[PDB]
């Protein structure tokens, strides 16, 4: 629509961190992440750092954490909403068993094709079913076709932030009981801690209010148990109770 | 020497945090933690906040995360090293199924008896086997007696920080394959990011050096896969590979 530009350069928050020490974040990456990062994940991350929407790339220390959660809960079938160049997708495919299956949804296939060569070299492309679409229609169609035996073990939500609450209503019905839903960026550069935050691009302000709404909603939702973790840009782990 | 003894008043790092601001940490606790905190946990926390070593009390948001970790991996047998007043121990007991069993080890039972009224009121004292002892002799005796049927699903290490590497050699054999070992305070107030750090208490400087060595050791240990998480004072999750 007509109006102002919504490029990455038009944002204000991209360089802000939720950790107060830039030396600490680099320590975590250099000490505990990069030595454990897959060769193809390193290649995908380095090309993505050059991309015009590099700020959306999931943090590498969060990637190792998502892989740990997948292995500890022995997830076999997952769904990812918001693929971009596919770092968390490749992280998920490497963590799942050899017969693991992933449904990856993103409106932009061109982003996915940048990281697909690294996904192929890692030899886990067969686990991924990419759907070039808006997520909400795909989710709604799934609820009409999904049976209880094929419910997802794990869901990673990382697409358009203001739509998280809408995705939530479908995903607690598409994720198995005891499964996990992980919402990315639920701390939104730390701006969620304030009733008002000046200097924001209108889209960043929308997610500040939408995440402040979502965090209250998730803390009051009886269908799930939650855990908000201050890793990366913040994330909220949801475990379905019924 | 003789006197009033050791106080956390003599430590330099008690008022530090890894997050960007105190407001961000306060937002997480009030939005995402306190409405999800068991009443007996809040009672245990509020008494412990007035104790003379309240700086060692595990963070409340980290507690909910350990609970989520125990539930997603369906842990049944766990072991805790360092109980203090028992906030993480209570968080563990409430997360495990009704037939869950915990081996809790601490040198000080007087700290544990501060929290045992809350554990009993929660109705989960039957899951706990407290052992007042130094942890290393107990673990060593476990390795001569334990069989494969008694291996632990989960281990939480939160005791004397310089002994973590020694605990690691025992716990990679006491935790089952695919089980989790979680080491607390592996970021040590952010001091691990620096090769030198001024004005630390000798014990505080002792743990900065030991944690910089342990973080390098865990990242190179081929027996486990790791994930360092910037929650609370930083923790490292280790999943046993073989
Ligand atoms: N309505 C929508 N439905 C599905 N995907 C959407 C969407 N709106 C935006 N997206 C996609 O969601 C992505 C968010 S960036 C996600 C980053 C990725 N998960 C990683 O690990 O790095 C963008 O690529 C964008 O194309
Ligand atoms: N060598 C040792 N062996 C076993 N426990 C020890 C120990 N040295 C110290 N400890 C215990 O480890 C505890 C560390 S404080 C632990 C905090 C607690 N886990 C929580 O959830 O808040 C102290 O209470 C101390 O009594
Ligand atoms: Mg994200
Ligand atoms: Mg601790």
What's the gap in Å between A177 CA and the centre of ligand 2?
35
How do strand B224-229 and strand B235-240 relate by DSSP bridges?
antiparallel
Alpha-carbon dihedral angle through residues B224, B229, B234, B236, given to the nearest 10 degrees: -10
Residue B89 makes CB contacts below 8 A (sequence gap 6+) with B80, B83, B102, B104, B112, B115, B119, B128
Distance from CA of B61 to the nearest CA of A (A): 7
Cα–Cα distance list, A198 to A13, A33, A146, B110 (Å): 11, 34, 44, 50
Going by C-alpha positions, the residue among B150, B158, B172, B159 that lies closest to residue B217 is B172
Using CA atoms, how far apart are residues B236 and B230, in angstroms rounded to an integer? 9
Looking at the DSSP bridge assignments, the partners of residue A239 are A180, A225
The H-assigned helical ranges of chain A are 22-28, 39-49, 60-72, 87-95, 109-121, 135-145, 164-174, 202-220
Neighbours of A42 (CB within 10 A): 13
The enclosing H or E element of B178 equals strand B175-184
**Which domains does chain B show, CATH number per domain?**
18-240 (3.40.50.150)
Main-chain phi, psi angles of B156, to 5 degrees = -120, 120
Cα–Cα distance list, B196 to A81, A159, B24, B212 (Å): 43, 41, 28, 11
B184 annotated as belonging to a binding site for a ligand: yes
Q: What is the DSSP letter of B36?
A: G
- The burial of B147, by beta-carbon neighbours within 10 Å (0-12 exposed, 13-18 middle, 19 or more buried), is given as exposed
The residue contributing the CA closest to ligand 2 atom 23 is B84
Going by C-alpha positions, the residue among B159, B204, B208, B200 that lies closest to residue B183 is B159
Using CA atoms, how far apart are residues B15 and B53, in angstroms rounded to an integer? 13
A31, A216, A224, best to mutate vs chain B, most B CBs in 10 Å: A31
* B115, B48 Cβ separation under 8 angstroms: yes
Encode burial over A62-71: b for 16+ CB neighbours within 10 A, e otherwise: bbbbbbbbbb
- Cβ-Cβ pairs closer than 8 A, A with B, add up to 153
Q: For ligand 1, say whether the CB of A233 is within 6 Å of any of its atoms.
A: no
Cα angle B124, B158, B152 (rounded to 5 degrees) comes to 60
Tell me the residues of chain A between 154 and 183 that have a Cβ less than 8 Å away from chain B: 178, 180
Measured in angstroms, the resolution is: 2.3
Residue A234 makes CB contacts below 8 A (sequence gap 6+) with A18, A185, A186, A187, A188, A192, A228
Cα angle A85, A87, A89 (rounded to 5 degrees) comes to 95
How do strand A152-157 and strand A175-184 relate by DSSP bridges?
parallel
Using CA atoms, how far apart are residues B209 and B134, in angstroms rounded to an integer? 22
Tell me the residues of chain A between 83 and 122 that have a Cβ less than 8 Å away from chain B: none
Using CA atoms, how far apart are residues B45 and B33, in angstroms rounded to an integer? 12
Using CA atoms, how far apart are residues A232 and B163, in angstroms rounded to an integer? 29
Neighbours of B192 (CB within 10 A): 26
Using CA atoms, how far apart are residues A183 and A235, in angstroms rounded to an integer? 6
With a Cβ cut-off of 6 Å, ligand 2 is lined by B 56-58, 81-84, 87-88, 105-108, 111, 134-135, 158-160, 163
Using CA atoms, how far apart are residues A227 and B136, in angstroms rounded to an integer? 32
Neighbours of A10 (CB within 10 A): 12
A229/B contact by beta carbon, under 8 A: yes
* A179, A155 Cβ separation under 8 angstroms: yes
DSSP string for residues in A166-218? HHHHHHHHHEEEEEEEEEETTTGGGGGGSS--TT--HHHHHHHHHHHHHHHHH
Distance of CA A123 to the CA centre of its chain: 22
Looking at the DSSP bridge assignments, the partners of residue A79 are A103, A155
What's the gap in Å between B54 CA and the centre of ligand 1?
42
* A172, A231 Cβ separation under 8 angstroms: no
- The burial of B12, by beta-carbon neighbours within 10 Å (0-12 exposed, 13-18 middle, 19 or more buried), is given as middle
Cα angle A78, B152, A153 (rounded to 5 degrees) comes to 10
* B44, B118 Cβ separation under 8 angstroms: yes
Looking at the DSSP bridge assignments, the partners of residue B104 are B80, B130
- Cβ of B71 within 8 Å of Cβ of A215? The answer is no
């Amino acid at each position: 629509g007509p109006g102002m530009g919504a490029s990455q350069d038009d944002y204000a928050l991209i360089h802000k961190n939720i950790l107060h020490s830039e030396d600490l974040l680099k320590y975590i990456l250099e000490t505990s992440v990069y030595p454990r990062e897959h060769e193809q994940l390193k290649g995908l991350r380095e090309v993505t750092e050059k991309h015009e929407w590099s700020s959306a790339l999931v943090a590498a220390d969060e990637g190792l954490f998502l892989s740990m959660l997948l292995k500890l809960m022995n997830a076999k079938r997952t769904i990812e909403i918001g693929v971009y160049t596919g770092y968390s997708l490749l992280t998920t495919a490497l963590a799942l068993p050899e017969d693991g299956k992933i449904t990856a949804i993103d409106v932009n296939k061109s982003y996915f094709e940048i990281g697909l060569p690294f996904i192929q070299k890692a030899g886990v492309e067969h686990k991924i079913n990419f759907i070039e679409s808006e997520a909400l229609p795909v989710l709604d169609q799934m609820l009409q076709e999904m049976k209880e035996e094929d419910l997802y073990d794990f869901a990673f939500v990382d697409a358009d932030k203001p739509n998280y609450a809408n995705y939530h209503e479908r995903l607690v019905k598409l994720v198995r009981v005891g499964g996990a839903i992980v919402y990315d960026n639920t701390l939104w550069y730390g701006t969620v801690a304030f009733p008002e935050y000046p200097g924001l691009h209108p889209e960043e302000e929308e997610c500040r209010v939408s995440f402040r709404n979502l965090n209250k909603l998730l803390a009051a939702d009886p269908r799930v148990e939650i855990s908000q973790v201050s890793i990366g840009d913040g994330l909220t782990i949801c475990r379905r109770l019924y």
